[PDB]
Design a protein around this ligand. Structure first.
Ligand SMILES: CC(=O)N[C@H]1CC[C@H](Oc2cc(-c3ccncc3Cl)cc3[nH]nc(C)c23)CC1
Ligand SMILES: [Ca+2]
Ligand SMILES: [Ca+2]
Ligand SMILES: [Ca+2]
Length: 311
């Protein structure tokens, strides 16, 4: 597929990552010194750590799990598939190990944090920036589907990471069933209405469209905002009530007058409740909003650094 091709810069960065990764070796707990806490999420705290032997800076997620030694070795073996997932739109993976009652997952460090964290800083994210985000998520989901036959299963702003180089990558896509089972939990407020009713990449496309709306307006779009909140933005529901709303009510949408019709049509085709009518990855890759965004020269790194205060 032409959408899986890489630039010369993307190919250079991918080779540089694998070249530095070959120098690492087997990860052990005592080889890490904590630098700072990057944040909490999905049953474990993520630390910015330094791998003392190699000197690299990594993100280390520690998941406290008390399981028999066999159960742990299965999770570690199932996470080894991440070594083969190499793409400019997938967060780089270093290794996983068990130590002192905690599963560690060491990955590439993204100094921009997640888009959940960026959204809290920005308030809302502009459409041109979200065009670059849409392109990366589509290509990331396409890479996982095409080269590995893998669904993400948990697309949301907190699982989309960015950095000061202008890169946008996905992470935390389901690869180990024994890890999800042993942790039984994550939010279901981004799941498609068909998954909430009892499973395809179409579900991930719903989650992308839902995440794009939240970042565009600056709030989780369900329940829909009233006209008073709109005039304050552009000029409580329990979780079980929220999931019932997703299944039994029409999908959310962008407000009129403030976003282009191509952007509105893009999220509309992502949020069609019928997965058969909902657009797939091939159709979205050639949507008018995506083709327009790909030709737009947007300085994402410059916008990101000034928005969150990186300097
Ligand atoms: C609500 C909210 O936004 N929570 C934040 C909390 C910090 C977290 O930060 C990372 C997490 C992971 C990661 C994800 C899955 N499994 C293993 C790991 Cl290591 C890799 C990372 N690389 N670089 C960074 C900065 C980073 C992102 C989500
Ligand atoms: Ca330790
Ligand atoms: Ca130790
Ligand atoms: Ca998860």
């Amino acid at each position: 597929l032409e959408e899986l091709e890489l630039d010369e810069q993307q190919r250079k960065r991918l080779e540089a990552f694998l070249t530095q990764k070959q120098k690492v070796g087997e990860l052990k707990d005592d080889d890490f010194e904590k630098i700072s806490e990057l944040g909490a999420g999905n049953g474990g705290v993520v630390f910015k750590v330094s791998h003392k032997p190699s000197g690299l800076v990594m993100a280390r997620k520690l998941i406290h799990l008390e399981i028999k030694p066999a159960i742990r070795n299965q999770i570690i073996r199932e996470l080894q598939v991440l070594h083969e997932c190499n793409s400019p739109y997938i967060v780089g993976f270093y290794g996983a190990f068990y130590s002192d009652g905690e599963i560690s997952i060491c990955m590439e460090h993204m100094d921009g944090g997640s888009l959940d964290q960026v959204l809290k800083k920005a308030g809302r994210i502009p459409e041109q920036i979200l065009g670059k985000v849409s392109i990366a998520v589509i290509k990331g989901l396409t890479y996982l589907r095409e080269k590995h036959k893998i669904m993400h299963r948990d697309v949301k702003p907190s699982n989309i990471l960015v950095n000061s180089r202008g890169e946008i990558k996905l992470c935390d896509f389901g690869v180990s069933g024994q890890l999800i089972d042993s942790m039984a939990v994550g939010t279901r407020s981004y799941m498609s209405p068909e998954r909430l009713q009892g499973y395809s990449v179409q579900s991930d496309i719903w989650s992308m469209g839902l995440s794009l709306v939240e970042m565009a307006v600056g709030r989780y779009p369900i329940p829909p905002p009233d006209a008073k909140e709109l005039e304050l933005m552009f000029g409580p529901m329990a979780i079980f009530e929220l999931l019932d709303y997703i299944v039994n009510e029409p999908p959310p949408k962008l407000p009129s007058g403030v976003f282009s019709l191509e952007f509105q049509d893009f999220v509309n085709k992502c949020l069609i409740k019928n997965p058969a009518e909902r657009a797939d990855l091939k159709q979205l890759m050639v949507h008018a909003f995506i083709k327009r965004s790909d030709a737009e020269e947007v300085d994402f790194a410059g916008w990101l650094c000034s928005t969150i205060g990186l300097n």
